[model samples]
Target chain A: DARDLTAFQKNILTVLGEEARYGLAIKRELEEYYGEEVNHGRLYPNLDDLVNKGLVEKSELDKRTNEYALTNEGFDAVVDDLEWTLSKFVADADRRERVETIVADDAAAL
Target chain B: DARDLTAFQKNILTVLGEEARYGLAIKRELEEYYGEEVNHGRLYPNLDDLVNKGLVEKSELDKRTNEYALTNEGFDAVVDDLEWTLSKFVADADRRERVETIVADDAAAL
Candidate 1:
């Protein structure tokens, strides 16, 4: 389970979970999440941590940059935690309806 | 931004989000979550810190036990991360439909 993961590590997975088929330019996405400049030293080590855990796959575009994507396990981790979150959040009918409305609204936008 | 929150802290928020109006017998819920016994020592410290941060509210059950619930800010934290998750996960119709199906099925179950 993702329970053992640090929030930073989980955030890495969460950011990668978004449309991550081809490797993404994730540094910017993470910076956006935290609203701060993420450090290359910190970011790469964690990316490597995820890679070592088999939760993420990384590829070198060149020595200057890298691209990262979620592996199947990574995606599974995202969905597992997500389902848990929804299961708790939708404990009441009104709350359930609220979540449904979010999905419906997003679907309409799509 | 809840982005600074640790996963354990977020998990506490998540558990409190699940019907925690009165003090929950949260020890069991947390155990169920991590599949291990949660330490009272660690749990209390974090709970107090969350209270300090103004994200969580705590009430005493004569000191041997305590009750907890989300403040508006804590609930807001949950939703903010949740919306971010949905926004990313629903990049395409196929992905979006799966999310819809999960929510729809839950609604049906309710």
Candidate 2:
């Protein structure tokens, strides 16, 4: 599970959940979430931590930027985290179904 | 607001969001989440960190045990965290509406 990772690392994985992204792009998403600018000092170390933990893979996008992709382990980690979070808030099958129906209806709107 | 806390610290607050709990009780909930034993060494320091940060209030339950509760600040922190997490997972308004419906139904169940 992602229990071993920090929340910051988990957010990074969440940003990459849909697609691989460069460092600046990931920072942008986090900045939006935090409603403030994210320091590169905080961003790069956690990115490196996820790489070291084997949850994310980094490739040289160019001389100046690097691309990060969620590995199988990373994808599983986010899934596990989402499940854990849902368990705390959702609590039952009936509720989960209702949530799904709502989500489906909303998804249709989009 | 809880962005400053570790996932472990956040989970501790999540458990306390329901009610005040003793140290062992918090450990019990976390163990169930982790499906393993949590070292006392790890648990207390984080608990102390939360106490130091003013998110969690700790009181002596007895000479040997302590009780923990979510302060107003702590509660606000969790709400902010839940919002941030939902924003990432829910995305658009439609998705958020769906998740809220699900959460509301789940709350009714409880």
DockQ comparisons of all candidates to the true complex:
0.65, 0.24
DockQ of 1: 0.65
Residue B7 CA displacement from its true place in model 2, Å: 2.3
Give the C-alpha lDDT of model 2.
0.77
TM-score between model 2 and native? 0.73
Tens digit per residue, CA lDDT, model 1, B29-90: 77777899888887778888888899898887676666789999999998888887887777
Output the lDDT of residue B83, model 1.
81
Residue B35 miss distance in model 2 (angstroms): 3.6
- Name the top lDDT candidate: 1
Docking class of 2: acceptable
Model 2 stretches astray by more than 4 angstroms: A34-41, A90-110, B62-64, B92-110
**Number of the top TM-score candidate:** 1
Q: Is the docking of candidate 1 incorrect, acceptable, medium or high quality?
A: medium
For candidate 1, lDDT tens digit of each residue in A21-107? 333457778788889988878877888888999999877666656678889999898888888888778777888777777776776
